[PDB]
Amino acid sequence: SPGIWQLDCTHLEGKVILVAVHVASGYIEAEVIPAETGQETAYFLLKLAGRWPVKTVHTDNGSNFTSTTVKAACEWAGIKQEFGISNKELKKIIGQVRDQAEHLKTAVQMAVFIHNKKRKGGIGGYSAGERIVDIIATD
Amino acid sequence: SPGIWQLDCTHLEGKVILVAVHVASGYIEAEVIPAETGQETAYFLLKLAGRWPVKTVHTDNGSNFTSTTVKAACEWAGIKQEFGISNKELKKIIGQVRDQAEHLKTAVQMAVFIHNKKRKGGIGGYSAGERIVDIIATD
């Protein structure tokens, strides 16, 4: 459970946002890429796996199953690719910040920041960022 | 101490690697950018700050003091920029992996992965990755 992530794509202003969700915490990492490709996905996974425990990645379609680069990233980093499994919450915050940022990728990272640091209902308990640290700190 | 980072640049194959070190853990985040610019630095800081507690960033020269974008990122994210303060360890591991990766940026992230996951002397105690989680988990 500390190593379980969901991976999805979302789209805004004709760009692609790669989104990884730490399922138990709701903690997010996101990346704006020029184009959906195996290589970009592989790179994102390798960066995420260098930063957090990533044991298993769930995706909801076949696209990641067709990349030899994703396959090599999986084997390099020890990530199990499993089939079968926030995007709209993220687009809401991106909409709140879009006009403080010249570039979409800036607004996406401002949205990721707010998502990971905020408390639920704006008061009490832990943010997603505190929750992932607390889940991992308990080995 | 949980929020204290050092920020530096390093260079390989004519590219620029942005390196942030969590001073108490030795945990690293790194990014290959096309060009040293204020904007790229600001973006890197905002991404790091969305992911970890970043309270204070130490740098060892004036370059980050001259960017209005870095200034705006600092104020947006609540990061204190302080003057006054791993690169060679990272270039060693990059040298070990360079030939498993077509792109330098891939080799840099493979190096970051090994740096953050390895134990000191290859046995016992915590990796940098476990150390940063343990330091933050103790609020």
Ligand SMILES: Cc1ccc2oc(C#Cc3ccc(C(=O)O)cc3)c(CC(=O)O)c2c1
């Ligand atoms: C308040 C704040 C905080 C962080 C920020 O990061 C950026 C940026 C950037 C960037 C642009 C282009 C490339 C590229 O060429 O790929 C890379 C990075 C800004 C500028 C903006 O967006 O308002 C910014 C502002």
Ligand SMILES: Cc1ccc2oc(C#Cc3ccc(C(=O)O)cc3)c(CC(=O)O)c2c1
């Ligand atoms: C085993 C393994 C693990 C992860 C990996 O990521 C990549 C990649 C990539 C990339 C290239 C170009 C852009 C760009 O156009 O900016 C962005 C990302 C690879 C391919 C390589 O480098 O060997 C790779 C392999």
